[PDB]
Amino acid sequence: LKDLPAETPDGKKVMLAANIGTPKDVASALANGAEGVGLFRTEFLYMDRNSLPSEEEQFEAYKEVVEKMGGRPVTIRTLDIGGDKELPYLDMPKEMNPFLGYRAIRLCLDRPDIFKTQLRAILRASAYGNVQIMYPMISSVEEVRKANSILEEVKAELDREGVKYDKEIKVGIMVEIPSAAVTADILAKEVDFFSIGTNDLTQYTLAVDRMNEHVKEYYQPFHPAILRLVKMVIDAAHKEGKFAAMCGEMAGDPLAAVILLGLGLDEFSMSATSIPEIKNIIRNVEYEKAKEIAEKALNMSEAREIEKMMKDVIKDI
């Protein structure tokens, strides 16, 4: 049943959640047993249009998802877009390397008018259910503090207006810039949770644009560096009594599941149709064994060795 938990035969439970891109994705997420939305991408509100999305428009979309998820947590990622999306109204610079450029939280900090509208909408939606905020493209704890300063300005304005919001709203970050993983210990003290964006973490850590056909082979999700950074983030979160999620494609990859379980990942967020397959793996591997396998993976020097091992593991299940 989609209602059985992702729980090992020796009693370790993890959370399986859905990544969504619009409110229409909710039905499929629940049908597949999602326990929450680990990543609500908000780009849909900004794309394919000629004006900034109003607070009310954003609010209605966030509220719909929050309500339909019936108390399950909904982690909303703030604007994660750059000038490569070539959106007219946004009036963005042409850039030589947009992936390393003026995008996401950097755009939001430079344009707090835009950022405040979205934060207002999210905070208003939090009165209707279990909402979390997640900042993308964070390189440093200094940026988290800047972002939170704006969030607090918005909360104070809502207080003055008598507009309600969840005063206990949890605010975390995407860990995708390598510096955020390397300094996860510093960040863990000042965020409520981490969610690892392994797609971009892998690209930045290996300096590879995986959409570039000429270098696609250099995108290596099982590179030991990636496993090391993932472990570092998970351990840093736990040292501070906080949770570590992953919403990058890796979390929905059956080959990565046992390693992630063994490393102590708390929440796996993925395309909804991937949930049953990962749940089945978790329900059929002992946590004690998964820890041993993760340990073996961390001792390996090549991505292909880890992949060979993980293929053998899945075969055995």
239 in Cβ contact with 185 (< 8 Å): yes
* 200 annotated as ligand-binding: yes
Residue number, nearest CB to Mg ion: 200
Helical ranges in the chain per DSSP H: 26-31, 55-68, 105-110, 112-125, 141-161, 178-182, 184-187, 198-205, 224-239, 254-263, 275-282, 287-298, 303-316
* 277 annotated as ligand-binding: no
Lookup: tokens for 136: 């993308």
268 in Cβ contact with 278 (< 8 Å): yes
Question: Considering beta carbons, is residue 50 or 301 the nearer one to a second copy?
Answer: 301
**Nearest C-alpha neighbor of 234 from the set 292, 187, 284:** 187
* 199 annotated as ligand-binding: yes
CB atoms closer than 10 angstroms to residue 168: 7
Q: Does 40 bind Mg ion (CB under 5 A)?
A: no
Which of Mg ion, a second copy, none is residue 316 near (CB under 5 to 8 Å by kind)? none
108 part of the active site: no
Q: HSE-up of 22 (CA within 13 Å, CB side)?
A: 6
Exactly one of 45, 92, 247, 270 is catalytic; which is it?
247
Distances (CA, A) of 57 to 16, 62, 78, 311: 29, 9, 15, 46
Instruction: List all residues 6 or more positions away from 314 whose beta carbon is below 8 Å from its beta carbon.
Output: 254, 255, 258, 281
Q: Does 197 bind Mg ion (CB under 5 A)?
A: yes
Which of Mg ion, a second copy, none is residue 215 near (CB under 5 to 8 Å by kind)? a second copy
Which of Mg ion, a second copy, none is residue 228 near (CB under 5 to 8 Å by kind)? a second copy
Using CB under 8 A as the criterion, which residues of the chain lie in contact with a second copy when the complex forms?
84, 93, 95-102, 106, 110, 137, 139-142, 176-179, 182-183, 186, 203-209, 211-215, 218, 220, 223-226, 228-229, 301-304
Lookup: tokens for 46: 């900004």
Contact with Mg ion (CB under 5 A): which of 25, 35, 143, 200?
Answer: 200
Question: Considering beta carbons, is residue 201 or 272 the nearer one to a second copy?
Answer: 201
What's the closest the beta carbon of residue 132 comes to a second copy, in angstroms? 23
Q: Does 178 bind Mg ion (CB under 5 A)?
A: no
Which of Mg ion, a second copy, none is residue 302 near (CB under 5 to 8 Å by kind)? a second copy
| Site residues, Mg ion (CB under 5 A) | 176, 197, 200
Residue ranges of the annotated binding site for pyruvate are 77, 199-200
- Which sequence positions are flagged as catalytic? 247
Residue ranges of the annotated binding site are 41, 77, 80, 176, 199-200, 210
